[PDB]
């Protein structure tokens, strides 16, 4: 049982990706090899991979995609990439073509969960509450059936790259234009406030289990934003906490997710809304997902072992 980890990626979460590879590599209960995708798309195998894993960022790589890697040597591949070319289904399909079992969501589920429009349409349809939104295709005349303020962000592009809060219905044109830079389609969502953020993790294939529920609170700026808190158990009557968990498990089911998902929720005026499912969350031993499950009773090592095994069932 040998495992292959692919960290890095061409997305803005590159550094965090390598940072996660560090945690996994250290506490993973399996002989594990590393492979790195440099910011320039080139791959780094062998020791160059780890040398980069030690530098906290891999500006450039050696092998053009597809890399001359020895997929033969591995039973399971653990992708740790974010956003575009990470959890959008592209890498997953590559793996399907190579016939390699892999950790996490498959093609379809990664692509749906990555697109802010289609995933909302599926969840809405399935009874999961989502924020009132609208999709705006490039060249299509905007039509917001609700008043500002609101959020505009490209349909499917990880990290807040291209997002913006819009106050005046007039400035909506600037928002779209910006977002259009990273995607042909964009979403306009009714901005909530007051608003609390709740996080919950899921483990398992299709019918997974939910970890306890946690709340993300931000501390004052000090200009740098303040340290985000990870309150858990989150301060919600047992009622809403359960509701949040069953809602996540339900969304996890209809979308056919596999392995894991960091499900984010918005709590505004007593109402819940599922913001998004992250098929590949941050994996440092001190990241939101592993910390959530540790609280649920699953050690970092055990969590990784269960994930890798799941890639085979």
Ligand X SMILES: Nc1ncnc2c1ncn2[C@@H]1O[C@H](COP(=O)(O)OP(=O)(O)NP(=O)(O)O)[C@@H](O)[C@H]1O
Contact residues: a copy of itself, CB under 8 A: 41, 65-66, 85, 88-94, 96-99, 107-108, 111-112, 114-115, 118, 121-122, 124-126, 135, 137, 140, 156, 184-185, 206-207, 253-256
Question: Of these, 195, 206, 228, 299, which contacts ligand X (CB under 6 A)?
Answer: 195
What does the alpha-carbon distance between residue 196 and residue 117 come to, in Å, rounded to a whole number?
Answer: 22
Query: 151: which residues sit within 8 A by CB, 6+ positions away?
Result: 163, 164, 165, 166, 187, 188, 189, 191
What residue 157 binds from ligand X, a copy of itself, none (CB within 5 to 8 A, per partner kind)?
A: ligand X
Q: Which 3 state secondary structure label does DSSP give 232?
A: coil
- Does residue 311 contact residue 75 with C-beta atoms inside 8 Å? no
From the CB of 229, what's the least distance to ligand X, in Å?
13
- Closer to a copy of itself by CB, 94 or 266: give it: 94
How far is it, in rounded angstroms, from Cα 100 to Cα 222?
47
Distance CA 290, CA 284 (A): 8
What would the DSSP string read from start to end of 37-48?
A: E-TTS-EE-HHH
In the bound state with ligand X, the residue whose beta carbon lies nearer, of 211 and 278, is: 278
Q: Residue 108's binding partner, choosing from a copy of itself, ligand X, none, with beta-carbon cut-off 5 to 8 A by kind? A: a copy of itself
Q: Report 257-296 residues binding ligand X (CB under 6 A).
A: 266, 275-276
Tell how far CA 83 is from the center of its chain.
7
Torsion of CA 12, 13, 18, 22, to 10 degrees: 160
**Residue 158 contacts ligand X per CB under 6 A:** yes
Residue closer to a copy of itself, measured from CB, 9 or 282: 9
Binding-site residues for ATP, in ranges, read 147-198
Site residues, ligand X (CB under 6 A)? 114, 116, 131, 151, 153, 157-160, 163, 189-192, 195, 197, 266, 275-276
């Amino acid at each position: 049982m040998r495992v292959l980890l692919i960290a890095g990626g061409v997305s803005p979460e590159h550094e965090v990706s390598l940072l996660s590879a560090e945690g996994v590599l250290r506490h993973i209960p399996f002989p594990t090899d590393l492979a790195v995708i440099a910011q320039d798309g080139r791959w780094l195998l062998g020791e160059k991979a780890l040398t980069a894993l030690e530098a906290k960022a891999a500006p450039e790589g050696e092998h053009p995609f597809p890399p001359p890697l020895s997929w033969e040597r591995y039973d399971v591949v653990f992708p740790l990439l974010h956003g575009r070319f990470g959890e959008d289904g592209t890498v997953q399909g590559f793996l399907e073509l190579l016939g390699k079992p892999y950790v996490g969501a498959g093609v379809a589920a990664s692509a749906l969960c990555m697109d802010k429009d289609l995933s909302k349409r599926v969840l809405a349809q399935a009874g999961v509450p989502v924020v009132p939104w609208v999709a705006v295709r490039k060249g299509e005349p905007p039509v917001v059936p609700f008043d500002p303020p609101f959020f505009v962000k490209p349909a499917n592009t990880g990290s807040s790259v291209g997002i913006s809060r819009v106050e005046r219905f007039q400035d909506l044109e600037a928002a779209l234009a910006l977002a259009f830079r990273y995607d042909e389609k964009a979403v306009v969502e009714k901005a909530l406030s007051p608003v609390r953020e709740l996080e919950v993790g899921v483990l398992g294939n299709v019918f997974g289990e939910a970890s306890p529920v946690g709340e993300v609170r931000y501390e004052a700026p000090f200009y740098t934003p303040g340290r985000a808190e990870l309150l858990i158990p989150a301060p919600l009557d047992p009622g809403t906490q359960e509701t949040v968990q069953e809602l996540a498990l339900k969304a996890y089911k209809v979308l056919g997710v596999r392995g894991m998902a960091r499900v984010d929720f918005f709590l505004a005026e007593g109402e819940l809304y599922l913001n998004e499912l992250n098929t590949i969350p941050g994996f440092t031993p001190t990241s939101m997902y592993p910390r959530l499950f540790e609280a649920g009773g699953v050690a970092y090592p055990e969590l990784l072992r269960r994930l890798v095994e799941l890639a085979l069932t």
